[PDB]
């Protein structure tokens, strides 16, 4: 969950060793040649007094399919709440294992 009135900004310069509340998803695979992906989405409400919903997804698929999936999960979360959706911010990454790899996607919450 993203606190109401929070702002999506580029990762700030975090203090070394800070304890950062973070929503993330990851997948690890040792299958040579396999493509694995991780994705994160943030559903932002039109009603700014409501919070934002963070959804994560990981799987043995392309980053395109992972981002599509995680964005739909966020959409569903807002429908379940019956909240008007402003938009969804999402990010995804894919990795093709060589020997043993990990794909990781996160939403780091901090303070400014």
């Amino acid at each position: 969950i993203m606190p109401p009135e929070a702002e999506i900004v580029p990762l700030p310069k975090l203090p070394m060793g800070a304890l950062v509340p973070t929503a993330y998803g990851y997948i690890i695979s040792d299958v040579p040649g396999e493509t694995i992906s991780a994705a994160i989405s943030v559903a932002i409400p039109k009603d700014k007094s409501l919070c934002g919903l963070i959804m994560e997804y990981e799987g043995k698929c392309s980053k395109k399919e992972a981002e599509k999936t995680v964005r739909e999960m966020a959409k569903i979360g807002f429908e379940m709440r019956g909240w008007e959706l402003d938009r969804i911010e999402s990010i995804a990454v894919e990795h093709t294992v060589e020997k043993l790899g990990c794909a990781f996607a996160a939403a780091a919450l901090w303070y400014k």
Partner: protein, 45 residues
């Protein structure tokens, strides 16, 4: 002068991937590649 309690007010989206000798080293390499390799994550759910 007087610390005021507050909820997080910023959210950043990052992502990364990496190979590794072990699952944890690969995970570590991914966070590093994502740009958050030198902070401790407290996973929220």
């Amino acid at each position: 002068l007087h610390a005021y309690f507050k909820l997080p007010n910023t959210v950043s989206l990052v992502a990364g991937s990496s190979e590794g000798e072990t699952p944890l080293n690969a995970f570590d390499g991914a966070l590093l590649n994502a740009g958050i390799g030198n902070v401790a994550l407290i996973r929220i759910s």
